[PDB]
Symmetry: none
């Protein structure tokens, strides 16, 4: 016989108090990109950017992240 | 015989108090992109950007994320 | 017989008090990128950027992260 | 017979009090990148940047991180 | 008494033989311009551009110029 | 008495033989310009560009120039 | 009495034989310019660029120049 008991408890807390965020300026002068890739062959769970000129301004009032992977494997 | 008990408890908290967000400016001068890719062949769960000139201004009042993958596998 | 009891407790705390964020300026003069890659062949859980000219301004009021991987494997 | 009891307790605390953040300026003059890679072959859990000219301005009011990997393996 | 004789002779020649002109490509990625000029005051024979984002493709089969200012001033 | 004789002779020649001009490519990634000029005051024969992001592709089959200023001043 | 005789002779020659011009590529990654000039005051025969991000591709089949200033001044 086998018994497995997986009873994790999480009363955890992730938080911020953040006042004014204010004067965020993001002013990029524009570059230049070239790519040559005579053939491509992607096959499983692939994430790809091949050519890109990508600006982001990401200004979250909180932006608090909490990743909580569980895995229970029996064989 | 086998018994498995998977009883995780989560009373967890993810939070922000964020005041004014205010003057976010995102003013990108526009680049230039070229790609040559004489053939492509994508086959399973592929995410792809091949050529791109992509600006984002992402300004969430909260933006708090909480990812909670469970997996229980028996064989 | 076997008994396994996996009962972790987490009352943990991740936090910030952050006042004004204020004058963040991000003003990049635009570069130049070239790539030649006569063939590519990606096959499992691949993350790829092949050519890129990517600016980010990431200004989270909190931005507190908490990664909590569990794994219980029985054989 | 076997008994395993995995009962870690974590009442831990990760924190900051951070006043004004203020005048962060990030003004990069734009470089130049070239890559030649006549063929590529990626196969498992690969993270790759092949050519890149990437600026980041990451200004989190908190930015406190807490990584908590557990693993319990029985054979 | 005074005599002035202004008898310049010009049998001059300005010329080109120019075959095919062919594949001129002019593909500009679009910039960004800002100007602040709280007051302006222009007064004689002024040529001005104050803000501009101006592309030209000027492809004259000849384009030969010949400027020939004379001036004779007596007092 | 006075005599002045101004009899310049010009049988001069300016020339080119130029075959094919061919593959001229002009592909500028787009910059970024800012100007602050709280007041301006221009007054005689002024040529001015105050802010500008200006591309030119000037491909004359000849483009031969010949400037020939004369001036005769008597007092 | 006075006699002045100004009889310059110019049978001069300016020339080129130039075959194919061919593969001229001009691919600038885009910069960034800022100017602050709290007041300006221009007054005679002024040529000015105050802020600029200016690309030129000037590909003349000939481009031969010939400047020939004369001046005769009597007092």
């Amino acid at each position: 016989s086998v018994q497995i008991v997986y009873k994790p408890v999480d009363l955890s807390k992730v938080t911020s108090k953040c006042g004014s965020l204010g004067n965020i300026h993001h002013k990029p002068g524009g570059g230049q990109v070239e790519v040559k890739s005579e053939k491509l062959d992607f096959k499983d769970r692939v994430q790809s950017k091949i050519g890109s000129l990508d600006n982001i301004t990401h200004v979250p009032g909180g932006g608090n992240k909490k990743i909580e992977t569980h895995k229970l494997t029996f064989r």
